[PDB]
Amino acid sequence: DDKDPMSAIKPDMRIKLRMEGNVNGHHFVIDGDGTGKPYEGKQTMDLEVKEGGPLPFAFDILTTAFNRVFVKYPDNIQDYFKQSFPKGYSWERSLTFEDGGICNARNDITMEGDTFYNKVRFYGTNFPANGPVMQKKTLKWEPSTEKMYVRDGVLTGDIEMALLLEGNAHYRCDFRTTYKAKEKGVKLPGAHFVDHAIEILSHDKDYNKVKLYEHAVAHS
Known part of the structure; x- marks a missing residue:
């Protein structure tokens, strides 16, 4: 009642990120520098491939990580996630694509001052060589709705995602993400939904540099 509601989560935050991983044996390191408005559900990040570029696969598969x-x-x-700070939280995600491609991603999120730090790992395998991921035929993720609910005691988000491809086709992916506050006494939320829209605002020809944007809103 007397607490500063924004004692940890300020209205304007910065974001620092490093992702390591490999997809179908192709290794990479990618850095991110961004800003966001947590109470508006908006964030923008400038990404730069630091090792392994040009990436031989669709950058889009990485962007929700x-x-x-x-x-x-x-x-x-x-709001389980703003309630997880200052200490932070982590998530683990399975990405199951319709052609047998499979990814596992994880992020450990801490906060130091005005900056969220992200330790991200991304591993993908079993993508067909002739498929749209390795051939770089993707255009965007469609806007989505994540179902947030408690599954066996752990906050879980399920999404039926789809990449729009060249040639009036879509390429479907199932997301399951588990979210775990670092403080083990955070109160779990009731079931709800989060609408997402993620998009690449600009990029170099080889996606060595990418500007990424997301807008997200929770509802019932």
Whole structure:
């Protein structure tokens, strides 16, 4: 009642990130520098491939691994992610594509001052050589709705995602993400939804440099 509601999560935050991983044996390191408005559910990040470029696969498969703090939560829904700070939280994600491609991603999110730090790992395998990921035929992720609910005691988000491809086709992917506050006493939320829209605003021809944007809103 007397607490500063923004004692940890300021209205304007900075974001620092390093992702390591490999997809179908192709290794990479990617750095991110960004800003966001946690209470508006908006964030922008400048990404730069530091090792392994030019990436021989669709950059789009990586972009949701580049923080559910950046969601506009109404007052009537418990905000597990803003409640996880200053200490932070982590998530683990499975990406199961319709052609057998499979990715596992994880992010450890800490906060130092005004900056979220992200330790990201991304591993993908079993992508067909002739498929749209290795051939770089993707255009964007479609806007999505994540179902947030408690599954066996752990906050879980399920999404039916789709990449738009060249040639009026889509390429489907199932997401399951588990979210774990570092403080083990954070209160779990009731079931709800988060609408997402992620997009690449600009990029170099070989995607060595990418500007990424996401807008997210929670609702019932």
